[PDB]
mmCIF file of C-alpha atoms and ligand atoms in Angstrom:
data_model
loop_
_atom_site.group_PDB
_atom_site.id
_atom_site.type_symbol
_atom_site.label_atom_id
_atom_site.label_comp_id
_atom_site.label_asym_id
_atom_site.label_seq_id
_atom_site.Cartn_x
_atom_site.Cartn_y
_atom_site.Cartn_z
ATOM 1 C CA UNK A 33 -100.296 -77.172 -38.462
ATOM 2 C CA UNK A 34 -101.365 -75.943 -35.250
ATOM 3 C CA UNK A 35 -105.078 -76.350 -33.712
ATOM 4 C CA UNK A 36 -106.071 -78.475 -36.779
ATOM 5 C CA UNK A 37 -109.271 -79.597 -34.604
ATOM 6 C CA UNK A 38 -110.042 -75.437 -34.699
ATOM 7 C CA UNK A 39 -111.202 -75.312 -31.382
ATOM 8 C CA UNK A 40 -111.464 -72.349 -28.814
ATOM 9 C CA UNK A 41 -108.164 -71.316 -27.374
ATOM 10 C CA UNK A 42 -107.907 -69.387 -24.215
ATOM 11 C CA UNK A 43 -104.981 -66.972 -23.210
ATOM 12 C CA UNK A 44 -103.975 -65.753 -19.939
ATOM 13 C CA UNK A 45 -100.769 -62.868 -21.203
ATOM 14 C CA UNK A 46 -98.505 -61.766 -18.160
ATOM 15 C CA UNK A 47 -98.192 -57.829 -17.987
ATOM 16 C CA UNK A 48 -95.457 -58.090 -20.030
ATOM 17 C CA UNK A 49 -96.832 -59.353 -22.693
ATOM 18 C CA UNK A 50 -99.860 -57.184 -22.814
ATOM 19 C CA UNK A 51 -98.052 -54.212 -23.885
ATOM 20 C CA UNK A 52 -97.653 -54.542 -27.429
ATOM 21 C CA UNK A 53 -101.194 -55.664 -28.709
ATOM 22 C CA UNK A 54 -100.306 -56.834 -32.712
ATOM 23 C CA UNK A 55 -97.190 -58.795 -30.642
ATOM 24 C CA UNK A 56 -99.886 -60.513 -29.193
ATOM 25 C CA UNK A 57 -102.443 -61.185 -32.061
ATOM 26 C CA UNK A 58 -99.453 -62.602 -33.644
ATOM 27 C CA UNK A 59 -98.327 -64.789 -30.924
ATOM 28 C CA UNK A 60 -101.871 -66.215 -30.873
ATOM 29 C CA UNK A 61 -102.042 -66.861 -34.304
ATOM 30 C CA UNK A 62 -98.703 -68.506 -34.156
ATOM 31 C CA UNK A 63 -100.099 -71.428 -32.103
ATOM 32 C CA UNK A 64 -103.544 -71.437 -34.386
ATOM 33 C CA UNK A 65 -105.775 -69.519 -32.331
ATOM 34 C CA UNK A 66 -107.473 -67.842 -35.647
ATOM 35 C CA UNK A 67 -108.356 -71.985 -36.775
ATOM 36 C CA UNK A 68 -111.282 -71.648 -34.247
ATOM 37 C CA UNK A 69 -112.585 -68.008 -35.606
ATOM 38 C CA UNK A 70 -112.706 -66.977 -32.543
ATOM 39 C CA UNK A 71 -109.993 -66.724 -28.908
ATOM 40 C CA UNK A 72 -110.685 -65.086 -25.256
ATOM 41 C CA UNK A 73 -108.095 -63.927 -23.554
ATOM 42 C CA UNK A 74 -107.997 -63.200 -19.881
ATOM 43 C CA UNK A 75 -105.992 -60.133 -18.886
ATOM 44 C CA UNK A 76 -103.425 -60.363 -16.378
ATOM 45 C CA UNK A 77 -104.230 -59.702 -12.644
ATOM 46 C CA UNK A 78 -102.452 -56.055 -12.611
ATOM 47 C CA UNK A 79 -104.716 -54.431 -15.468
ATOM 48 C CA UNK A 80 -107.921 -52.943 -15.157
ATOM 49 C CA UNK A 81 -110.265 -51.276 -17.764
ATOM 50 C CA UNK A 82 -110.945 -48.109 -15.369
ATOM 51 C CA UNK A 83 -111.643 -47.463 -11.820
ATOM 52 C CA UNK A 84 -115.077 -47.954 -11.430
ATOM 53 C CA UNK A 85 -118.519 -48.295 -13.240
ATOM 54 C CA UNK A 86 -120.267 -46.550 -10.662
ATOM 55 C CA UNK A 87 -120.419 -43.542 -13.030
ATOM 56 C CA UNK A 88 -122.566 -44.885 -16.697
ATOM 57 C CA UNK A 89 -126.108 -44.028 -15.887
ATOM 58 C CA UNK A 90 -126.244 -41.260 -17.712
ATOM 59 C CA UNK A 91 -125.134 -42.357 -21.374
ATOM 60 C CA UNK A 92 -127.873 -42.250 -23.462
ATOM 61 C CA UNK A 93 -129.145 -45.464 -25.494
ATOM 62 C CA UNK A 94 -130.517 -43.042 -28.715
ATOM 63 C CA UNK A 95 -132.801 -45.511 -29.918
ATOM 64 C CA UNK A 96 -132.991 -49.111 -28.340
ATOM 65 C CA UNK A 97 -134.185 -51.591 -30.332
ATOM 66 C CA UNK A 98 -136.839 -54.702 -29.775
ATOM 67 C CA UNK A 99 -135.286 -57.811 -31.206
ATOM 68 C CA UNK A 100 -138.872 -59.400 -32.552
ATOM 69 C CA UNK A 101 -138.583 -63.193 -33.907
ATOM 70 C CA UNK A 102 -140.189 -65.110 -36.169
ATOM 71 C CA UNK A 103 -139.679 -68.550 -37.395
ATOM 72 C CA UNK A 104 -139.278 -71.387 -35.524
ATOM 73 C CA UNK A 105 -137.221 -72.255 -31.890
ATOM 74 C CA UNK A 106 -134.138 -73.649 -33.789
ATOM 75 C CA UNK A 107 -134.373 -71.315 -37.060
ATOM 76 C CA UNK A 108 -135.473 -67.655 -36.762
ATOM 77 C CA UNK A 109 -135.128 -64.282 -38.135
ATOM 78 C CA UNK A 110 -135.585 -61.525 -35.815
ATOM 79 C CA UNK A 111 -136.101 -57.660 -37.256
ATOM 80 C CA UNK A 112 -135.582 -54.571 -34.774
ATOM 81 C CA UNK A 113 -138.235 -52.201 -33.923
ATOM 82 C CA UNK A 114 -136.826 -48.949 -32.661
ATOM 83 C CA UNK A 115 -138.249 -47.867 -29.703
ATOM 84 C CA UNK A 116 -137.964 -44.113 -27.526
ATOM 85 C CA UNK A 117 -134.158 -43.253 -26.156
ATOM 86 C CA UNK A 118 -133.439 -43.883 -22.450
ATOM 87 C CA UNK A 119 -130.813 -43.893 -20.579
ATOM 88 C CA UNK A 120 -128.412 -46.627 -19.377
ATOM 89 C CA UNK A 121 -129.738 -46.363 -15.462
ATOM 90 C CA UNK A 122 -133.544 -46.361 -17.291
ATOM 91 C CA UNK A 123 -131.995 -49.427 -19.547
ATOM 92 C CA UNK A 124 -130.749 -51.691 -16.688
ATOM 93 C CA UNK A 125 -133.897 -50.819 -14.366
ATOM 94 C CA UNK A 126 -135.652 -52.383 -17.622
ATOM 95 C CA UNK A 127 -133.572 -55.265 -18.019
ATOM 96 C CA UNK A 128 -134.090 -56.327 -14.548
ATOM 97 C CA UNK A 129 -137.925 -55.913 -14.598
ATOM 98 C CA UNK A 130 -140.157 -59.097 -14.085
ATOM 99 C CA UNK A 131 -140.693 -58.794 -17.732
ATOM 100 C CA UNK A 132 -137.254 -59.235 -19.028
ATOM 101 C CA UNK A 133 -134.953 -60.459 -16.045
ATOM 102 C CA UNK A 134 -132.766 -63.644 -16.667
ATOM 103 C CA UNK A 135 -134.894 -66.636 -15.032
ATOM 104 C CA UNK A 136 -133.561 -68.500 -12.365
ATOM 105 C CA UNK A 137 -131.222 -71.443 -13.489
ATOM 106 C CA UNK A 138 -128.875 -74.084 -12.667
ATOM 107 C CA UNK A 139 -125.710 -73.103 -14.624
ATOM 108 C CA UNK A 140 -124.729 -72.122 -17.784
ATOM 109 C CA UNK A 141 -125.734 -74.836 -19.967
ATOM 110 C CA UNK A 142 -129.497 -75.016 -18.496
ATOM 111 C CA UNK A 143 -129.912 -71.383 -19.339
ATOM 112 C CA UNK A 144 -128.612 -72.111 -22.650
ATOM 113 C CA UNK A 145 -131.315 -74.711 -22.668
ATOM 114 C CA UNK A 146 -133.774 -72.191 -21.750
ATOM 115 C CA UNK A 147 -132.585 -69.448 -24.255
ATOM 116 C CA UNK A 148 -133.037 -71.761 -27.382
ATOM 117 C CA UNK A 149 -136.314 -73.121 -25.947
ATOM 118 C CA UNK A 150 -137.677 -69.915 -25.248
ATOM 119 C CA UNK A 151 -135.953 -67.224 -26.989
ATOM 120 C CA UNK A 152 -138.394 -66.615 -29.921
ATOM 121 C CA UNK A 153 -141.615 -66.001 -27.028
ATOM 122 C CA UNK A 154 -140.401 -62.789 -25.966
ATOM 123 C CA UNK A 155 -138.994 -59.185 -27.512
ATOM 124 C CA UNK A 156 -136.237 -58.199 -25.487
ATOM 125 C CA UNK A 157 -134.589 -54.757 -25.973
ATOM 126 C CA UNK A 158 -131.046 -53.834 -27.075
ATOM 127 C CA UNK A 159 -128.380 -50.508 -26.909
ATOM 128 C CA UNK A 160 -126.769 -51.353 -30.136
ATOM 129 C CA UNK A 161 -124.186 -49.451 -31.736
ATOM 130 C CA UNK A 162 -123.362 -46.612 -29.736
ATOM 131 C CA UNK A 163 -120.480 -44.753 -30.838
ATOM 132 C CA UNK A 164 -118.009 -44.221 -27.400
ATOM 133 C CA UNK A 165 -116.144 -46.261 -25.188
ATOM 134 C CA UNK A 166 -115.547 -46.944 -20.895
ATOM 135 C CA UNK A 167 -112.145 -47.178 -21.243
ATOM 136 C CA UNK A 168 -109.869 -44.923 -18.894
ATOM 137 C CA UNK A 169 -108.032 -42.692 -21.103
ATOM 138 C CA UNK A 170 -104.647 -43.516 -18.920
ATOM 139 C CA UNK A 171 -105.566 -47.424 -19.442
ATOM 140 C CA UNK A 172 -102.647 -48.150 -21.626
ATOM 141 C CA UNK A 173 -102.776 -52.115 -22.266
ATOM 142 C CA UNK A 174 -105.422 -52.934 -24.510
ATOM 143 C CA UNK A 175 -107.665 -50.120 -24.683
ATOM 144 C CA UNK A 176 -109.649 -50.727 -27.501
ATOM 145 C CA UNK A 177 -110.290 -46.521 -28.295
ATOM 146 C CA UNK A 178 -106.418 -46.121 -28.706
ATOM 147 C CA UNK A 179 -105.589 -49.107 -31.214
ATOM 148 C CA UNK A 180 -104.057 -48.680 -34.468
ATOM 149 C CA UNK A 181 -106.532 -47.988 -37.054
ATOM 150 C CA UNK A 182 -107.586 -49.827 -40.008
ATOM 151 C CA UNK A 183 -106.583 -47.151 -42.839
ATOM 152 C CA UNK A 184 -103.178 -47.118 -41.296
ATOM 153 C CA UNK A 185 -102.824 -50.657 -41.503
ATOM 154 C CA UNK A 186 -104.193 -50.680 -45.268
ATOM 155 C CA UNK A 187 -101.701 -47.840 -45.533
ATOM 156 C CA UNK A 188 -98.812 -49.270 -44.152
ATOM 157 C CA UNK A 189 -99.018 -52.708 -45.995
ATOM 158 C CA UNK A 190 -100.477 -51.325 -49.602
ATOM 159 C CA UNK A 191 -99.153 -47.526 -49.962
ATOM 160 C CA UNK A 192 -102.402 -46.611 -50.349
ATOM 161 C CA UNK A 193 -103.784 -43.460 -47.683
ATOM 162 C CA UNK A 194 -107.799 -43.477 -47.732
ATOM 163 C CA UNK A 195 -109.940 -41.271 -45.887
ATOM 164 C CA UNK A 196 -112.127 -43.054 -42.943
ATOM 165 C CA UNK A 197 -111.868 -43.681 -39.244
ATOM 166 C CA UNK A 198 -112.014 -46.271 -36.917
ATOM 167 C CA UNK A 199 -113.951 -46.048 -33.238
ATOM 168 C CA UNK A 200 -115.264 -47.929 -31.053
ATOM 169 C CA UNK A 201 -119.214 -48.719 -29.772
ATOM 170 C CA UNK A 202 -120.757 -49.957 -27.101
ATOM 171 C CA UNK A 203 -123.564 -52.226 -26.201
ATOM 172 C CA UNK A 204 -125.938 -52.457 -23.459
ATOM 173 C CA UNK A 205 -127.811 -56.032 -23.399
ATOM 174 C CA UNK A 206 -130.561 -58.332 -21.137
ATOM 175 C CA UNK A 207 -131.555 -61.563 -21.335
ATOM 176 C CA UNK A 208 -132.033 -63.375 -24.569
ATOM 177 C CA UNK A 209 -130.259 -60.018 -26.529
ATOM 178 C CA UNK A 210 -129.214 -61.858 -29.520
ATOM 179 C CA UNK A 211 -126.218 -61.504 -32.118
ATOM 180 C CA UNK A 212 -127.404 -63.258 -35.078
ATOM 181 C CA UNK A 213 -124.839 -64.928 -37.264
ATOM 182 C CA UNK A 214 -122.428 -62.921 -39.643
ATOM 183 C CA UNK A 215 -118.858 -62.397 -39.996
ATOM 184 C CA UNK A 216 -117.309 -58.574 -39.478
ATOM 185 C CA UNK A 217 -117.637 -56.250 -42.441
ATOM 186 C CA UNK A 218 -115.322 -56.534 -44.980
ATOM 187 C CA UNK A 219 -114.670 -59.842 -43.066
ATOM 188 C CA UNK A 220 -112.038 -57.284 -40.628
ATOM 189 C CA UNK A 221 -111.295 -59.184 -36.919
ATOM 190 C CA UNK A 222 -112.853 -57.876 -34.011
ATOM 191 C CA UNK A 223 -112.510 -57.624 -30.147
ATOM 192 C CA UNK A 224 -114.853 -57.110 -27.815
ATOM 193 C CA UNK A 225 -114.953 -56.243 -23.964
ATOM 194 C CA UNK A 226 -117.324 -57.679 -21.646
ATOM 195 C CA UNK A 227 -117.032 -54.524 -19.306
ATOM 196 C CA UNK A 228 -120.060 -55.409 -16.568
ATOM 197 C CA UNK A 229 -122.539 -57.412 -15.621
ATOM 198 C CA UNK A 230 -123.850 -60.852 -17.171
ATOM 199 C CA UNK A 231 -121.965 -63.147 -19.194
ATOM 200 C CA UNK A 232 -122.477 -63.927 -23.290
ATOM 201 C CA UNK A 233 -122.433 -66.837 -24.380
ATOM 202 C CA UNK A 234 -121.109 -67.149 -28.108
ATOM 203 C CA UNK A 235 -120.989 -69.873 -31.112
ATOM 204 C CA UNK A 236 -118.116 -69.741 -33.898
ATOM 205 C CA UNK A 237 -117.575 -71.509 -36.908
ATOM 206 C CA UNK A 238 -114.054 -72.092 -37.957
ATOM 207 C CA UNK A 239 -113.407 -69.423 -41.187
ATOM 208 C CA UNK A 240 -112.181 -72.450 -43.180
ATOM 209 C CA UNK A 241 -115.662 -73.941 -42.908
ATOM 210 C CA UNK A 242 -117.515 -71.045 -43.699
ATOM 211 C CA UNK A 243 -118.764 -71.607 -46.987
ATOM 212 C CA UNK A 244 -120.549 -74.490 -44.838
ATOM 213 C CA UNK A 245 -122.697 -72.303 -42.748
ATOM 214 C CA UNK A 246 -123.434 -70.301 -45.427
ATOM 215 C CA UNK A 247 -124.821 -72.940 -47.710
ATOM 216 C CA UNK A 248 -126.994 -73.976 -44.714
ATOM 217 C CA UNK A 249 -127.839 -70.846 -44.470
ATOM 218 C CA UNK A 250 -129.547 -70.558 -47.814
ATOM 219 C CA UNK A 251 -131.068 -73.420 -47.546
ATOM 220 C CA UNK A 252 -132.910 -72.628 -44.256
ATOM 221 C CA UNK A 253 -134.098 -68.921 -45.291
ATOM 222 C CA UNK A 254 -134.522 -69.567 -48.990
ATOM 223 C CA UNK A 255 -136.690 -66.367 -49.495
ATOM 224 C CA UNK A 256 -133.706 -64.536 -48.058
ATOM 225 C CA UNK A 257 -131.113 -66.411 -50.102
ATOM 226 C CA UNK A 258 -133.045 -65.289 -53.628
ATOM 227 C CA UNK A 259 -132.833 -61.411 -52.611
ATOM 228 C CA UNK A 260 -129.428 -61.472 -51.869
ATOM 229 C CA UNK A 261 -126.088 -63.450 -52.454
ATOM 230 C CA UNK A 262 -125.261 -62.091 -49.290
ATOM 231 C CA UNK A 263 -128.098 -61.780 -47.076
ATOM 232 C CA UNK A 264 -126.671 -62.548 -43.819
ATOM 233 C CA UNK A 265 -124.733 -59.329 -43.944
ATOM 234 C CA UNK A 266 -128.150 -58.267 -42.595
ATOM 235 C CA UNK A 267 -127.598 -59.730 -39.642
ATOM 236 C CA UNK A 268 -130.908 -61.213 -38.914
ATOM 237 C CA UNK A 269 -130.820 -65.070 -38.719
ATOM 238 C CA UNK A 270 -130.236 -67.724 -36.334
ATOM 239 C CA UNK A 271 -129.494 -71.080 -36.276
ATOM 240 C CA UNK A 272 -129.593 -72.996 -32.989
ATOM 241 C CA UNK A 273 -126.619 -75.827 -32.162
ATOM 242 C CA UNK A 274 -128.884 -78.081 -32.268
ATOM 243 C CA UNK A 275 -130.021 -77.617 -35.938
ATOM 244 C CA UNK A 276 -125.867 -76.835 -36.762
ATOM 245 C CA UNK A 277 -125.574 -80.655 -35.390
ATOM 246 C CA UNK A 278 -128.567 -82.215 -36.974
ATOM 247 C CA UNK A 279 -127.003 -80.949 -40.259
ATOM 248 C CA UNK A 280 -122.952 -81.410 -39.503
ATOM 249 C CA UNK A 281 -122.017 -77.930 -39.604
ATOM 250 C CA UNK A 282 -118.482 -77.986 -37.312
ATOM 251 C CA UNK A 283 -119.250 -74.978 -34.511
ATOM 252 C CA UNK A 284 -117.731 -74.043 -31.229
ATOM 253 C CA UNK A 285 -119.202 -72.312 -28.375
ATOM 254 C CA UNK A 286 -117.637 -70.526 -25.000
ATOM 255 C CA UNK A 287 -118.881 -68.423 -22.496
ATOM 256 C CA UNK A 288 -117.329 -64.646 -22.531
ATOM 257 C CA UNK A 289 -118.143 -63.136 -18.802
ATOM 258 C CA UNK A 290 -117.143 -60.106 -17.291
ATOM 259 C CA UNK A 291 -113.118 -58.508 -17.556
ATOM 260 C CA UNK A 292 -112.126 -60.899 -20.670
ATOM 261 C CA UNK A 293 -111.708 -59.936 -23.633
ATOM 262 C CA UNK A 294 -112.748 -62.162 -27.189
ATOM 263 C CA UNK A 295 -111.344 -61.791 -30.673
ATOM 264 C CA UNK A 296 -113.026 -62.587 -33.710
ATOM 265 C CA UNK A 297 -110.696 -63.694 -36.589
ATOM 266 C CA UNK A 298 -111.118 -62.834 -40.257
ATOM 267 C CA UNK A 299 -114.020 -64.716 -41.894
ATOM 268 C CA UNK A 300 -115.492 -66.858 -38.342
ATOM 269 C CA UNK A 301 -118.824 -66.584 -38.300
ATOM 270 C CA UNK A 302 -120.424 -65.952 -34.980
ATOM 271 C CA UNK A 303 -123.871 -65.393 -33.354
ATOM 272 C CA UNK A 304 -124.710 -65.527 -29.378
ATOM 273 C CA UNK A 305 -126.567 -64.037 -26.742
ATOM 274 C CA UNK A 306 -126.823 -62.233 -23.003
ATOM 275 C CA UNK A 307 -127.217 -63.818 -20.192
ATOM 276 C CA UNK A 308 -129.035 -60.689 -18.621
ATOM 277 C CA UNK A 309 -127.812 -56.668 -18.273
ATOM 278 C CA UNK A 310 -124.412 -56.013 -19.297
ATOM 279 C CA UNK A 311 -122.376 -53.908 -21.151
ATOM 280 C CA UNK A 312 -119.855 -54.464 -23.730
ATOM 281 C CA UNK A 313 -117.454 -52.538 -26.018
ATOM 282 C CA UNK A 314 -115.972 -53.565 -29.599
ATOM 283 C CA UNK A 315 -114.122 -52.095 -32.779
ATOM 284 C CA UNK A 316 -112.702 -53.975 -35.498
ATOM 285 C CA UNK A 317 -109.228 -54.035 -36.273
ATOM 286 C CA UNK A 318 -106.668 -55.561 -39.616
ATOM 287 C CA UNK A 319 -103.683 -57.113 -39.484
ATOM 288 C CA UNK A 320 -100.727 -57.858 -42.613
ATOM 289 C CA UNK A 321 -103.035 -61.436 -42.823
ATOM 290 C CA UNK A 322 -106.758 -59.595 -43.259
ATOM 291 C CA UNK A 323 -105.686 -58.348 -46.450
ATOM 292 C CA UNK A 324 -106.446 -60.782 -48.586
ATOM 293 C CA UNK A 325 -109.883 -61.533 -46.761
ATOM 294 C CA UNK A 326 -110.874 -57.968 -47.464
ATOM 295 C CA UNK A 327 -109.931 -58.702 -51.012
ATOM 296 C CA UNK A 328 -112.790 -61.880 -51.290
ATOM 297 C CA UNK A 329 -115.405 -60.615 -48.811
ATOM 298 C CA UNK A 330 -118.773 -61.636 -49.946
ATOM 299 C CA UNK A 331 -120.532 -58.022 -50.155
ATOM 300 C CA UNK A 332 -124.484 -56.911 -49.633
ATOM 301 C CA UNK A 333 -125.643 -55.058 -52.847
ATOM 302 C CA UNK A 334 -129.634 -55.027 -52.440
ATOM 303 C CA UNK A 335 -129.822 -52.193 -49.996
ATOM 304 C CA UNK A 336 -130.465 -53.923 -46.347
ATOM 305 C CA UNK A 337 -126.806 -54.162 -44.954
ATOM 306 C CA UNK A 338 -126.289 -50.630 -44.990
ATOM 307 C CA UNK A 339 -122.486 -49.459 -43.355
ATOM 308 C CA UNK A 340 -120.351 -47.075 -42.267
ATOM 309 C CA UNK A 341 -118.533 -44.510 -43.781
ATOM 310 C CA UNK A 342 -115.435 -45.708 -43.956
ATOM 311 C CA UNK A 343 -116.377 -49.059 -45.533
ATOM 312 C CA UNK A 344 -116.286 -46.755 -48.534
ATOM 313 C CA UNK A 345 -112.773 -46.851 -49.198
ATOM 314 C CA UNK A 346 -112.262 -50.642 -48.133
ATOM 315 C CA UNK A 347 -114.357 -51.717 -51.279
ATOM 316 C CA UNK A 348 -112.567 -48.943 -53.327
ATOM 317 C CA UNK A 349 -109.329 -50.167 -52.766
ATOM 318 C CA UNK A 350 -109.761 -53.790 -52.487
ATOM 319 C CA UNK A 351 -112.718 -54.447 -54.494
ATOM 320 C CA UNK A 352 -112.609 -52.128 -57.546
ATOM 321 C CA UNK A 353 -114.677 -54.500 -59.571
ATOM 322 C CA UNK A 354 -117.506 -54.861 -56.880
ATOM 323 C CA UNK A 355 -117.297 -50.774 -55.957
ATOM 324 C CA UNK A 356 -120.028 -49.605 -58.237
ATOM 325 C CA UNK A 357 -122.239 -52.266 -57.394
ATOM 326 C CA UNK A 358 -121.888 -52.490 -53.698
ATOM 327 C CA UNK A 359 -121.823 -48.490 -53.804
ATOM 328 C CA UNK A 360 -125.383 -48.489 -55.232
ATOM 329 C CA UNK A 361 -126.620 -50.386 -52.593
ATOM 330 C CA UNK A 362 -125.669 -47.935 -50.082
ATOM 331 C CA UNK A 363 -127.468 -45.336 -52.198
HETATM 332 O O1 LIG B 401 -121.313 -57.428 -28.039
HETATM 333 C C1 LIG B 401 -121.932 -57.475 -29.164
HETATM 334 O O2 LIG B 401 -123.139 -57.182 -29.217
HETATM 335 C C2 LIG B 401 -121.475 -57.920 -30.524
HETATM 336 N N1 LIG B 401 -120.078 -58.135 -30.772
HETATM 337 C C3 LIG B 401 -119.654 -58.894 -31.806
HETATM 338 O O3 LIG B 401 -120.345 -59.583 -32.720
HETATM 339 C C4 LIG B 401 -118.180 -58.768 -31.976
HETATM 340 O O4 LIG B 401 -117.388 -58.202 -31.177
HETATM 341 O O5 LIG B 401 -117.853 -59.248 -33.090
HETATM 342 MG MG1 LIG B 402 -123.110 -41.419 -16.913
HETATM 343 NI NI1 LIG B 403 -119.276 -59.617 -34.659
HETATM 344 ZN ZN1 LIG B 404 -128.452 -57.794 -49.133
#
């Protein structure tokens, strides 16, 4: 079996090889990339995402949101206040304020020091969401608005055709942003751009060792765990490495930093954070091996997770016996 330790791989594809994207997902998963729950790969020296960013400032963040903690340095919930639209050129004058700038540090790992330390003292503010993308349109490698979509591939493998689409969204972040841990919806993969600025730094637990994290989990939110079976499809809690060691939960962290891409693999929990103003763009995707992770996701009934569209017809399909349910608590 390849990668039996799960870790991290990292993958530098020539040009040639970073034409035909499933090729590649494949390839990686052929020498056990998807053990880890998460790969970055580095794009070859030829490609670019577009010309320039010199262009953004003028996308509008709708509503950003205030990430506000509470709990304790190593195990915290945070809950987002929305807060008045601005724009991306308002956003990064913002992020690199007194207020929320990165502090200075000595590398990577002292800031990461700092960020677990510190992180639940201050409220910084996030562009979450935002349906669009910064790809070139004549960027043909890679360009995560022009993949193949997720009904197709639920199409192509089942027979079944299902209304829905699939698009991308971007994300505008600062210092101490945070990701708090989940796995994708329906437990699809993902990918995810690191277009400019600051790095993120990211933590992954293998997907066979999931049930792991989520039995600490309940544990260290109990209140949480007895209101839903589910409850970190909200997206709200985080668990430090430190506390993931002190309680031998097997993790993995890397640092994602500007022009590399990451994958997220079908049931790897993740959480992370920024390292100060950047941007980033993600979608998920499927592959032939998601389907039978759709087909055992653990689903949100009690109302918070709240999704999408075209979620709809994943649960439809795959979960018939869950649908009405899981369908109430998106009404
Ligand atoms: O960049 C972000 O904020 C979040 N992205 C992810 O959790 C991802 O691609 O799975
Ligand atoms: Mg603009
Ligand atoms: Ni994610
Ligand atoms: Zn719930």
């Amino acid at each position: 079996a390849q990668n039996p330790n799960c870790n991290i791989m990292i993958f530098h594809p020539t040009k040639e090889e970073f034409n035909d994207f499933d090729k590649y997902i494949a390839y990686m998963e052929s020498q056990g990339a998807h053990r880890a729950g998460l790969a970055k790969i580095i794009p070859p020296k030829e490609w670019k995402a577009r010309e320039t960013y010199d262009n953004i400032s003028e996308i509008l963040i709708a509503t950003p949101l205030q990430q506000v903690a509470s709990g304790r340095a190593g195990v915290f919930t945070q809950y987002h206040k929305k807060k008045k639209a601005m724009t991306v050129g308002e956003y990064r004058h913002l992020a690199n304020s007194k207020k929320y700038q990165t502090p200075p540090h000595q590398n990577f790992e002292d800031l990461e020091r700092k960020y677990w330390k510190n992180r639940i003292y201050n409220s910084p503010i996030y562009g979450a969401d935002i349906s669009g993308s910064l790809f070139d349109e004549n960027t043909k490698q890679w360009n995560l608005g022009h993949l193949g979509t997720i009904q197709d591939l639920l199409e192509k493998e089942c027979g079944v055709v299902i209304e829905g689409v699939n698009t991308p969204y971007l994300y505008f972040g600062m210092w101490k942003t945070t990701f708090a841990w989940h796995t994708e919806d329906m437990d699809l993969y993902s990918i995810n751009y690191l277009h400019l600025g600051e790095p993120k730094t990211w933590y992954v637990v293998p997907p066979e060792h999931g049930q792991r994290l989520e039995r600490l989990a309940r544990e260290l939110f109990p209140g949480s765990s007895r209101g839903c079976g589910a409850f970190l499809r909200h997206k709200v809690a985080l668990i430090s490495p430190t506390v993931l060691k002190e309680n031998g939960i097997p993790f993995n962290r890397i640092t994602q930093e500007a022009g590399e891409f990451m994958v997220t693999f079908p049931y790897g929990y993740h959480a992370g954070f920024n390292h100060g103003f950047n941007c980033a763009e993600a979608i998920n995707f499927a592959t032939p091996r998601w389907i039978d992770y759709g087909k055992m996701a653990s689903q949100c009934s009690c109302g918070e997770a709240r999704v999408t569209f075209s979620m709809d017809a994943f649960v439809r399909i795959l979960q018939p016996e869950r649908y009405d349910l899981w369908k109430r608590g998106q009404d």
